[PDB]
Structure formats: C-alpha cells, structure tokens
Amino acid sequence: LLSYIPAPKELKAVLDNYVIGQEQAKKVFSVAVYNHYKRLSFKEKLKKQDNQDSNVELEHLEEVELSKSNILLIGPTGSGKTLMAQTLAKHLDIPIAISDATSLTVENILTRLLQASDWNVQKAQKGIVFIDEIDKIGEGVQQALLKIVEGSLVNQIDTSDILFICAGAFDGLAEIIKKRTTQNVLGFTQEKMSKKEQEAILHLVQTHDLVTYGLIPELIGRLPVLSTLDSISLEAMVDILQKPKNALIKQYQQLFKMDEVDLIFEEEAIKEIAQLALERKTGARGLRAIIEDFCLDIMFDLPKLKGSEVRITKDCVLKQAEPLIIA
Ligand SMILES: Nc1ncnc2c1ncn2[C@@H]1O[C@H](COP(=O)(O)OP(=O)(O)O)[C@@H](O)[C@H]1O
C-alpha cells in the first residue's frame, strides 16, 4: 500500500496507543517513516504516470540525491525501540525482519524479510530491516552490512528502497558525549554522571560521537536520523500497565470478564507491580511474568469467584496476602 501514507501525526497517534513516553523519539520516528514512504510513493506515482513532466521531476529527484533516511535508535534496553518499529510496520502492513548484530560475531537477513512478505520481491523491497545492538560492533560486520544499507543487489533482491533501522544502548556513548564534547564544565564536579544524566546527555549526541564510539563514518552517514529514548521511569511503567490499547491489565480484565468476574488493580498494587519490574530489572518485558506469578492461583480457582469482584492489592501482588473478593 503505497497508495496512502498516513501523516506523521497519524502515525504518531498509532504510536501513542502502544508506546508510553518517548515523545521526541515518537515524533522523530513518525516524520522519518513518513518521509521515507512519501518518497517511495511519490516516486512510484510519476513512473506509472509515464510522461515528460513527471519524467523531469524523477530526474531532479534523482539529481538532488535525497539521501535515504535510515534510522538509528539509541536507548536503554526495553524502552520501546523495536516496539516503535513493530507498531508502525504492523499498521502500514509492512513486512519487517528483526535481526541481531551479534549474529555476526549476511544475506540471511533479507531472507527472513522475503519470508515475511510471501517472497514477493516488491513488498519486501518496501519493507523494514531492523538491526538490533548495532552497538555490539566488529569493524568488519559494519562494512559487510554497509553494502546492503547503502543499497545493492543480492541473490534476487534489491535493497535500495528498504528502510534500515539500527538500534542499541551504546552503553559507552554516554561518557564520550561527556569528555571531548561541547557544553563542557568548568566547575567542580562531584562524581560520575548519574544514569539519569548519563541518559539525558545522549539527547545531545552528534555524528562525531558515534564515531568515537567505534562506528565507521561510512555507516553513520547512512543513518541520517538519530533518535534517543529514555529509560522507563516508575510513572511510565505504571502507565504501560494500564494505558495502552493492549495494556496487560485490560487483557486480564478481558479474560476474567468472560467468567463474569470484575477484576480491579488497586493503585498501590499497580505501583507495586511497576516498582518490581524495575528492581528485578526485568523491565517492561517482565510485567506479564510478575502478574502471572500472583494471578495463576487466582485464575486456577476463578469459578468460586464468578459473578463477584476480585480486587488486587499491594499485599496480594507481593504474595503476602489473598485478593479482596467482594460480593
Ligand atoms: N515505551 C514503552 N511503552 C510501552 N511498552 C514498552 C515500552 N518499552 C518497552 N515496552 C514493552 O517491553 C518490550 C521491550 O520492547 P522493545 O522496545 O522492543 O525493546 P528495546 O527498546 O530494547 O529494543 C515491548 O515489546 C513492550 O511490551
């Protein structure tokens, strides 16, 4: 569907229904995914149009050389990086293949994409290639990847119009943007940056930073768009449990409702579940596992609760108590 690329605000709206926080990154991703697809669409419009007017534009669009906006997502693990990508790829119904930088301590990647788009060369060439942990790399993998990102022919697939998205935590980058970098400091500094600032300084990263980190200028140039995500705070985590369209709590309420039980998570209960996910550093990924751990018993004997109201509390969450069944 290169027929209609929803506006950046529309895309961002979809994003908002699944990703909490990361407002800037959401904005940057939306505009970036839009510009990428507006171009492929616009470009396709002319060709079909097949005439002299639309043919001059095609030449100018080529002459001007509109660099492909491959994206580079930088943010702590579990912040919504591949989620943002997955969310939109599912909305625009675009085939997307996720991979791992470590896999290359190859063409194999484009293979999954084909599998993800029914071997239809066309849809695959309009798809997304997600490279996670681009930060884990060695100096060879990059170049081996660069050929494909830059755009080449592989056997057959043409990777020229494939949107590349690289992601990583770049654990080191934090300090690098706090050594030989602008907005320096003349005063007496008390100690190493707190991960709060060590994650807030990233939002001030420039291309020369990714280099120092160990990224070949050849690849960084291929990632015009840099987007940084924060770490999930307690408040956002609290929102993730209840706000999104597919929020865990609504899943559990949907499931309990089928057996005519009204399931309620008391505020401090949600706060406790969220605070747990952080400690255990199991992140947002670990929310379902924490809920299952104190809900299993409840779901096991749910019938003797039919028609009533089950109220989840902090104690219950901490498994220091039973849930509040209310007639
Ligand atoms: N910002 C977020 N908003 C809502 N859910 C999130 C967010 N970040 C992470 N999650 C949850 O945790 C999982 C980790 O997702 P992901 O973004 O792909 O990780 P990473 O940022 O390391 O690439 C998601 O699939 C989702 O269920």
Swiss-Prot record:
Gene Ontology BP term (one): proteolysis involved in protein catabolic process
Top-rank taxon: Bacteria
A cellular component term, taken from the record's GO annotations: HslUV protease complex
GO molecular function, one term: protein dimerization activity
Record note on quaternary structure: Component of the ClpX-ClpP complex. Forms a hexameric ring that, in the presence of ATP, binds to fourteen ClpP subunits assembled into a disk-like structure with a central cavity, resembling the structure of eukaryotic proteasomes.
Shown part of the complete sequence: 75 to 438 of 446
Organism for this UniProt entry: Helicobacter pylori (strain ATCC 700392 / 26695) (Campylobacter pylori)
Described function: ATP-dependent specificity component of the Clp protease. It directs the protease to specific substrates. Can perform chaperone functions in the absence of ClpP.
UniProt KW keywords: ATP-binding, Chaperone, Metal-binding, Nucleotide-binding, Zinc
The protein, known as: ATP-dependent Clp protease ATP-binding subunit ClpX
Family: Belongs to the ClpX chaperone family.
Residues engaged in binding ATP: P76, T77, G78, S79, G80, K81, T82, L83
